[PDB]
Design a protein around this motif. Structure first.
Motif, PDB file in Angstrom:
ATOM      1  N   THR A   1       0.983   0.100   2.678  1.00 17.32           N
ATOM      2  CA  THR A   1       2.386   0.172   3.065  1.00 17.32           C
ATOM      3  C   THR A   1       3.233  -0.446   1.955  1.00 17.32           C
ATOM      4  O   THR A   1       4.376  -0.043   1.732  1.00 17.32           O
ATOM      5  CB  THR A   1       2.654  -0.599   4.385  1.00 17.32           C
ATOM      6  OG1 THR A   1       1.832  -0.070   5.430  1.00 17.32           O
ATOM      7  CG2 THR A   1       4.115  -0.472   4.799  1.00 17.32           C
ATOM      8  N   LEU A   2       2.662  -1.418   1.251  1.00 19.22           N
ATOM      9  CA  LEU A   2       3.383  -2.094   0.178  1.00 19.22           C
ATOM     10  C   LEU A   2       3.001  -1.616  -1.230  1.00 19.22           C
ATOM     11  O   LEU A   2       3.577  -2.068  -2.216  1.00 19.22           O
ATOM     12  CB  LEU A   2       3.204  -3.613   0.287  1.00 19.22           C
ATOM     13  CG  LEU A   2       3.185  -4.309   1.658  1.00 19.22           C
ATOM     14  CD1 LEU A   2       3.289  -5.814   1.463  1.00 19.22           C
ATOM     15  CD2 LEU A   2       4.310  -3.831   2.553  1.00 19.22           C
TER      16      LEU A   2
ATOM     17  N   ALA B   1       2.682  -4.251  15.465  1.00 18.19           N
ATOM     18  CA  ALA B   1       2.264  -5.441  14.731  1.00 18.19           C
ATOM     19  C   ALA B   1       2.257  -5.188  13.220  1.00 18.19           C
ATOM     20  O   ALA B   1       2.716  -6.028  12.448  1.00 18.19           O
ATOM     21  CB  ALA B   1       0.893  -5.898  15.210  1.00 18.19           C
ATOM     22  N   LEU B   2       1.747  -4.027  12.813  1.00 15.86           N
ATOM     23  CA  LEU B   2       1.708  -3.637  11.402  1.00 15.86           C
ATOM     24  C   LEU B   2       3.126  -3.712  10.842  1.00 15.86           C
ATOM     25  O   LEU B   2       3.364  -4.362   9.814  1.00 15.86           O
ATOM     26  CB  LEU B   2       1.185  -2.201  11.261  1.00 15.86           C
ATOM     27  CG  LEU B   2       0.765  -1.640   9.893  1.00 15.86           C
ATOM     28  CD1 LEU B   2       0.177  -0.262  10.097  1.00 15.86           C
ATOM     29  CD2 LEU B   2       1.918  -1.562   8.911  1.00 15.86           C
ATOM     30  N   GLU B   3       4.059  -3.063  11.542  1.00 15.93           N
ATOM     31  CA  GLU B   3       5.465  -3.035  11.143  1.00 15.93           C
ATOM     32  C   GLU B   3       6.024  -4.434  10.993  1.00 15.93           C
ATOM     33  O   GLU B   3       6.680  -4.738   9.998  1.00 15.93           O
ATOM     34  CB  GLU B   3       6.313  -2.250  12.153  1.00 15.93           C
ATOM     35  CG  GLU B   3       6.135  -0.734  12.091  1.00 15.93           C
ATOM     36  CD  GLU B   3       7.034   0.013  13.071  1.00 15.93           C
ATOM     37  OE1 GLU B   3       6.532   0.926  13.765  1.00 15.93           O
ATOM     38  OE2 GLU B   3       8.241  -0.308  13.143  1.00 15.93           O
ATOM     39  N   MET B   4       5.756  -5.289  11.975  1.00 20.22           N
ATOM     40  CA  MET B   4       6.236  -6.664  11.927  1.00 20.22           C
ATOM     41  C   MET B   4       5.679  -7.388  10.705  1.00 20.22           C
ATOM     42  O   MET B   4       6.410  -8.063   9.994  1.00 20.22           O
ATOM     43  CB  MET B   4       5.835  -7.416  13.186  1.00 20.22           C
ATOM     44  CG  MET B   4       6.479  -6.915  14.450  1.00 20.22           C
ATOM     45  SD  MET B   4       7.073  -8.325  15.379  1.00 20.22           S
ATOM     46  CE  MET B   4       5.549  -9.013  15.920  1.00 20.22           C
ATOM     47  N   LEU B   5       4.390  -7.208  10.437  1.00 23.61           N
ATOM     48  CA  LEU B   5       3.766  -7.859   9.293  1.00 23.61           C
ATOM     49  C   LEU B   5       4.341  -7.381   7.959  1.00 23.61           C
ATOM     50  O   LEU B   5       4.591  -8.190   7.058  1.00 23.61           O
ATOM     51  CB  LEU B   5       2.248  -7.669   9.333  1.00 23.61           C
ATOM     52  CG  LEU B   5       1.543  -8.387  10.487  1.00 23.61           C
ATOM     53  CD1 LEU B   5       0.041  -8.145  10.426  1.00 23.61           C
ATOM     54  CD2 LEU B   5       1.846  -9.872  10.422  1.00 23.61           C
ATOM     55  N   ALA B   6       4.575  -6.073   7.851  1.00 25.91           N
ATOM     56  CA  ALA B   6       5.126  -5.483   6.636  1.00 25.91           C
ATOM     57  C   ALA B   6       6.561  -5.932   6.380  1.00 25.91           C
ATOM     58  O   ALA B   6       6.901  -6.301   5.260  1.00 25.91           O
ATOM     59  CB  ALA B   6       5.055  -3.956   6.708  1.00 25.91           C
ATOM     60  N   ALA B   7       7.393  -5.909   7.422  1.00 29.22           N
ATOM     61  CA  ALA B   7       8.800  -6.301   7.312  1.00 29.22           C
ATOM     62  C   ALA B   7       8.962  -7.738   6.840  1.00 29.22           C
ATOM     63  O   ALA B   7       9.851  -8.043   6.041  1.00 29.22           O
ATOM     64  CB  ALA B   7       9.511  -6.104   8.643  1.00 29.22           C
ATOM     65  N   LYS B   8       8.102  -8.618   7.342  1.00 28.36           N
ATOM     66  CA  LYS B   8       8.144 -10.021   6.962  1.00 28.36           C
ATOM     67  C   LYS B   8       7.783 -10.139   5.485  1.00 28.36           C
ATOM     68  O   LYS B   8       8.402 -10.902   4.742  1.00 28.36           O
ATOM     69  CB  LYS B   8       7.176 -10.836   7.833  1.00 28.36           C
ATOM     70  CG  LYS B   8       7.032 -12.299   7.425  1.00 28.36           C
ATOM     71  CD  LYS B   8       8.383 -13.002   7.312  1.00 28.36           C
ATOM     72  CE  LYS B   8       8.246 -14.349   6.611  1.00 28.36           C
ATOM     73  NZ  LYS B   8       9.565 -14.920   6.210  1.00 28.36           N
TER      74      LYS B   8
END
Lengths: 199, 201
Positions: free
Chosen positions: A25-26, A189-196
């Motif tokens: 994602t990154l 959860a994935l989204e939350m981890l990526a956004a942070k």
């Protein structure tokens, strides 16, 4: 200054898929260090041992090397991550390069076990899954995909994996800042981890 | 414009309340908080004695329809008249309190993740996890130190009512959560992640 995320959980808990997804994602803005890429080099022992060794016990991991690599990436220095020769079950002299990045991911069953490792993390995550579900995933992969025998998968899980998870992996859950269930299939959860991370 | 709905469950004194309140504080006027504990069924039709024996941890004590109703209203930017519980008569009073709509809605309470209808309304389902011994201690200290209760009273009430409800109804809902938050009363990292995720809009 680089963002450090530690991702722990049981074997086949989905922690690997979660980290791999986070990295993709990154893109090239990350540096992923899989702890399983850091087993102790035991080329000196015969192939009698090796495979006969408990690869889920802390002592099987080259903690020192891992910490060093973790520290280098932290100081913006590239690392020469160890390639494993699963053809002979010993650390391959080949070295896979890991370019330093603004965000670092440390994933593995014992990535939250040592204090010197936890202290390096800005964000700690534990991928939670029930023993039966973790066993089933490992099962479906080894028997259906890798052609392993049912009996062998059972034995290795019972005498090696289970006792290590209970004694070493499971207790490290209390150190996590966030616990993520269904690590392999959890878009939120994935989204939350990526956004942070993107912060 | 959806808006953003977050479900926050956990056991009594797990810090779920502390987390929700602190999250709503960061979001300011941009968040609508509806604690389900403000939705206990109206028991005026029951003599005081019967109301005293009701287990407030059983899902049957909660007015689900009214809660689901108000949740659906706020999902349409519509304000609601949230009820207020009277401790003098141990029942829901006729007085209400307006809850203005907002881009982010927080549905919090024990059993907030219990009904399917409610879970379908949530974009993020959070379960605040804490060990039963610690949950008891936290609740114990709060009741003896801030409510003048005796340690024997808290124990009996905890053993015969709270524990079985948590085990039979609350604990099972942990499996529906998207994220599990430990040490809910003191977790700035989880709180920031929840704040920033809500600030996504």
């Amino acid at each position: 200054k680089p963002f450090v995320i530690g991702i722990a959980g049981g074997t086949a808990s989905g922690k690997t898929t979660l980290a791999q997804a986070l990295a993709r994602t990154l893109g090239e803005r990350v540096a992923l260090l899989p702890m399983d890429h850091y087993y102790k080099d035991l080329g000196h022992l015969p192939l009698e041992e090796r495979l006969r060794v408990n690869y889920d016990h802390p002592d099987a991991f080259d903690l020192a090397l891992y910490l060093e690599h973790a520290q280098a990436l932290l100081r913006g220095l590239p690392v020469e991550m160890p390639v494993y020769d699963f053809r002979a079950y010993t650390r391959s002299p080949r070295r896979t390069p890991v370019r330093p990045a603004p965000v670092v991911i440390l994933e593995g069953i014992l990535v939250l076990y040592p204090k010197e490792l936890r202290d390096l993390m800005d964000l700690k995550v534990f991928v939670d899954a029930d023993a039966d579900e973790r066993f089933i995933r490992r099962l479906k992969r080894d028997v259906l995909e890798r052609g392993r025998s049912l009996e062998g998968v059972v034995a290795q899980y019972l005498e090696q994996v289970k006792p290590m998870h209970l004694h070493f992996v499971e207790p490290t859950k209390r150190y996590a800042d966030v616990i993520v269930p269904r690590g392999g299939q959890n878009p939120v959860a994935l989204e939350m981890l990526a956004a942070k991370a993107l912060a």
